[PDB]
Structure 1
């Protein structure tokens, strides 16, 4: 059944609750972003209203073929009324089109649902600062002090310099980037840009990026693989077997592949710096795992919550075990006691 943490009390609303059939009493289904755990259930045969950002709406329409009459895109940073309830959609600093949602309940309660986010000090100067939030439904993906990672800017600086060096030493080297969803577009765009290339990809993936309102996007991407030295492949293909195979397909235009696997966290984060990353190598093929996160680090989460000072926190990730629930609740109390709310 639809879990309680997908339900917004005092409303007929659910958030990211598309795989439970008709939910008894739901008058509007919110979708925070276009990742498949969150949209799972949606199709052309859906006949309830879906509320979402303009970008999420383009993807529902063109990728999932949801009929245009059931898609209700809202603008960000604007007070809107939906079935009698004031709502605002805010940038979540996750993948493109991803949002957080502020609900103003008729009774005076204010609720913030983060969807998936990477907390940032910039959110402390959004509409959030203007009034008190009583309940917070929180992306807790990385709620444990081991989870540190570098800034997205630091990671991108790394990738740009790595690629530029390898290609300038060997102009017959190919750069490959792994992907299995929207998100983490900066990696392949920032590399392609230092190299004076467009990014080459499949037709389905080109379709997906054309949904995202990226400025001057036409200048940056293509389906013509052969004119391009930064290729996107499915993440499943980012390995020695899969890259050797792919290297063959280019017909001796390339003699070396350098590949990037954007990961979330991996346990080398506990010991190693970004400056000190190294690849796995078999022959003329090297693979880098780079920790580009679009979720909050522990410290970024902590800071957001201590700034917001909510009355109750409801986690939306890692909820399925008693051990994880218990651990999260402990850190929430630590934060509350340290910041005196």
Structure 2
């Protein structure tokens, strides 16, 4: 899927890389390095690209986008970007920690269009309201929201509570190897927590270890499989056939940390609602505190509602 947006009546494109559809009167932004946000973005990209410093490093390393075009913006600062070559108009952009994955940010856009807050992918935490850029009384005219888990019937625990569910599960199997199905990026802090909790080395891929060292996490990761019982694998590897394959070597439990209602054939495959996306209740509190004039879903194909009673008149 493609979860990028061309914001109408603005010079803004976020996680949206189709040259034909975007046009030439746009500035391009990248919230984070998940593949559904970099569709069409590769080493051939030849336009200015604005992102976080961590995203900037990952972008050049793994997609080979030239450093000529990569524009790393410091988080928490107001950046003034030119919209033309004659110093006629500018746009002010402020990056805010999205609490989603390494490098993930929210964008605060200010310009002729007004004020727009673009969350990208984010997990709401109350500290986001205490952001200096959001405590200036500025009216947010449009709030683009991560509506991934925007289902009122879907109750999700906090990441800490979900991490506890994972810990409890692993505790029941002290003799088992543990397969954690992940994307190439994200939930590294979960791995670090599991490493310390069970005093084990967490086996990664050479790519992940390279990433972890950038984050400056604890020295608890390695590429040698014989070193630990907790293994970070690609989520696609977790299925019935691979469970039988893995059990030939050692008793194995597989864990899928996701808010998606994935069902498994194998009894030893566990799907636990550990999510990097805000829950419905967290979304409600986020919007209620900001009170924007309008709320627009980033994930168009997915449901998004229940925010009329939290909007602002202006």
Alignment of 1:99 with 2:98, yes or no, is: no
Shift of 1:133: 1.3
Tell me if 1:299 matches 2:281.
yes
- Cα distance change of structure 1 residues 202 and 140 upon mapping to structure 2, 3 Å threshold: same
- State which of 191, 194, 199 in structure 1 corresponds to 2:197: 194
Deviation at 1:8, TM superposition (A): 5.8
Residue 261 (structure 2) aligned to one of 258, 266, 276? 266
SS in 2 for 1:150: coil
* Partner residue in 2 for 1:135: 142
Contact 1:144–1:298 under 8 Å retained in 2: yes
Asked if the contact 2:3–2:15 (Cα under 8 Å) also holds between the matched residues in 1, the reply is no
**8 Å contact from structure 1 (residues 184, 292) kept in 2:** no
Partner of 2:85: none
More helix per residue: 1 or 2? 1
SS of the equivalent of 1:61 reads helix
CA distance in 2, matches of 1:259, 1:207: 24
Match of 1:89 among 84, 95, 103: 95
Residues 1:3 and 1:62: Cα distance change in structure 2 (over 3 Å): closer
- Seen in structure 2, the aligned counterparts of structure 1 residues 43 and 296 have a Cα distance that, compared at 3 Å, is same
Work out whether 1:257 is the aligned partner of 2:252.
yes
1:206 corresponds to = 209
In 2, the alpha carbon distance for the partners of 1:40 and 1:3 equals: 9
**CA RMSD across the alignment:** 2.7
More off after superposition, 294-303 vs 177-186: 177-186
1:243 maps to 243
TM-score normalised over the length of structure 2: 0.87
Q: 2:240 touches 2:265 (CA, 8 Å); kept in 1?
A: no
Deviation, 1:147, is 2.0
- CA deviation after TM superposition for structure 1 residue 17, in Å: 0.9
Match of 2:308 in 1: 333
Report deviation, 1:146.
Answer: 0.9
The 5 A counterparts of 1:1-341 are: 5-7=5-7, 9-10=9-10, 12-21=11-20, 23-83=22-82, 84-106=90-112, 109-126=114-131, 127-130=133-136, 131-167=138-174, 170=175, 173-210=176-213, 213-217=214-218, 219-248=219-248, 252=249, 254=250, 256-266=251-261, 286-317=268-299, 319-320=300-301, 324=303, 328=304, 331-336=306-311
Give the direction of change, closer, same or farther, for the CA distance of 1:194–1:79 in structure 2 (3 Å limit): same
The separation in 2 between residues aligned to 1:292 and 1:5, in whole angstroms, is 26
Task: State the structure with more CA Rg.
Answer: 1
Residue of structure 1 equivalent to 2:87: none
DSSP-derived class of the 2:127 partner: helix
Structure 2 CA distance for aligned equivalents of residues 17 and 5 of structure 1: 6
SS at match of 1:6: strand
The range that moved more, 34-43 or 13-22, is 13-22
Quote the Cα distance in structure 2 between the aligned partners of 1:4 and 1:164.
40
Instruction: Give CA deviations for 1:173-213 in whole Å, capped at 9, x if unaligned.
Output: 21211112312223322222222222112233434444xx3
SS at match of 2:173: helix
Partner of 1:272: none
- Seen in structure 2, the aligned counterparts of structure 1 residues 20 and 115 have a Cα distance that, compared at 3 Å, is same
TM-score of the superposed pair, with normalisation by structure 1: 0.81
Distance 2:3 2:191 in 1: 37
